[PDB]
Design a protein around this ligand. Structure first.
Ligand SMILES: [Zn+2]
Ligand SMILES: [Zn+2]
Ligand SMILES: [Zn+2]
Ligand SMILES: [Zn+2]
Lengths: 218, 217
């Protein structure tokens, strides 16, 4: 099934892509579009180039100018659309580490990157933070101060999951500490958006800590 | 992780391959190798070409001759290795319907196929039956008379699963009836092997009926 885009706050839209795995069935994958007047910013690409094309069309058919994307780690469900955005001369961003992981794997790289543990896209609109390793070594989160939405990406687990998911690239014994670093930011979080699953409240962070500590102890 | 092969009965081996799905994690997929002396028959290929190569090496390193594979529906977890086996001149089989679905999807096709609802491979070694639509329109099962094992493939669900799984290609309202067609064969089933998850007893058939009927509603 094709990309879905739904409004979740003023100037903030959830975009969701779908993929099938034989045996299990459909899995969903989330990113955001954030609007600033008529400027649009993409937080994580859709899971495929085709779905990325649909997202770009969503924006441009509304008269929005897509200013940039940021991807929150190197995996395909965050970065599949980087190549397409590059081809359209739309600035693409990741952390330095994410960029160099992509380069090492021979994948398309973003045209821009940031070096610090903190950075902003859209001149303050979107605050990025690297809290430490968890789902992957490079996962970052995004804080949207106006809508009070924390985009946790795949570092956070929604309530519908009772496991950490794909952990081949994970640092399980570091994961709880990394969530605690997010909590220490003292963001006035009203909503947390996971990379997979339904939007929830700040208790998603507590749930993720539980899952990480349980897995660590095994 | 790589292919795993483990003995589940004299002359019957479970092969399991793994694929990662971002968001969910590790998923497993099962097939069988069935031996007649040193002649080996593969029920469903592994989930990738690479794991299929490992399965062939497993067999030949043991001095087995791989006679044929049979795939129990068109999906990639059943058929990923057909191309490789074709390239090695190892006969590959599906039902006629499964072959035609593969062709229509532009996927590699088997070199052999059977036309009726029943077919036997080896010398009475493996009995194939098409019970009707369920997981997919083309799903078949394989019955092993000697070991009394039913390979139900992805038409049956293991007890550790709470749902039917991927139903995009399914006929949910037909699924329970199709299981009942299997039951009507009155096979003296002592073990059921699912396409995904742990091997169990014949009660896997009842469990699958329960899931199908619940979903039908
Ligand atoms: Zn990931
Ligand atoms: Zn993800
Ligand atoms: Zn299937
Ligand atoms: Zn399957």
């Amino acid at each position: 099934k094709p990309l879905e885009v739904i409004k979740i706050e003023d100037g903030v839209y959830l975009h969701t892509s779908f993929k099938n795995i034989e045996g299990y069935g459909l899995v969903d994958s989330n990113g955001l579009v954030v609007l600033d007047n008529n400027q649009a910013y993409i937080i994580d690409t859709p899971w495929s180039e085709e779905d990325t094309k649909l997202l770009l069309s969503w924006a441009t058919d509304r008269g929005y100018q897509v200013m940039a994307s940021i991807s929150t780690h190197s995996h395909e469900d965050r970065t599949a659309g980087i190549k397409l955005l590059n081809s359209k001369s739309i600035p693409t961003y990741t952390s330095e580490l994410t960029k160099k992981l992509l380069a090492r794997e021979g994948k398309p790289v973003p045209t821009h990157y940031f070096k610090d543990d903190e950075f902003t896209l859209g001149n303050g609109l979107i605050e990025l933070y690297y809290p430490g390793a968890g789902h992957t070594e490079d996962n970052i989160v995004a804080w949207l101060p106006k809508s009070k939405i924390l985009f946790g990406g795949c570092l956070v687990r929604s309530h519908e999951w009772e496991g950490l998911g794909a952990v081949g690239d994970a640092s399980i014994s570091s994961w709880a500490d990394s969530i605690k670093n997010i909590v220490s930011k003292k963001y006035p979080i009203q909503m947390v958006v996971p990379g997979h699953g339904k939007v929830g409240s700040s208790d998603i962070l507590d749930h993720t800590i539980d899952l990480a500590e349980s897995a660590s102890n095994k």
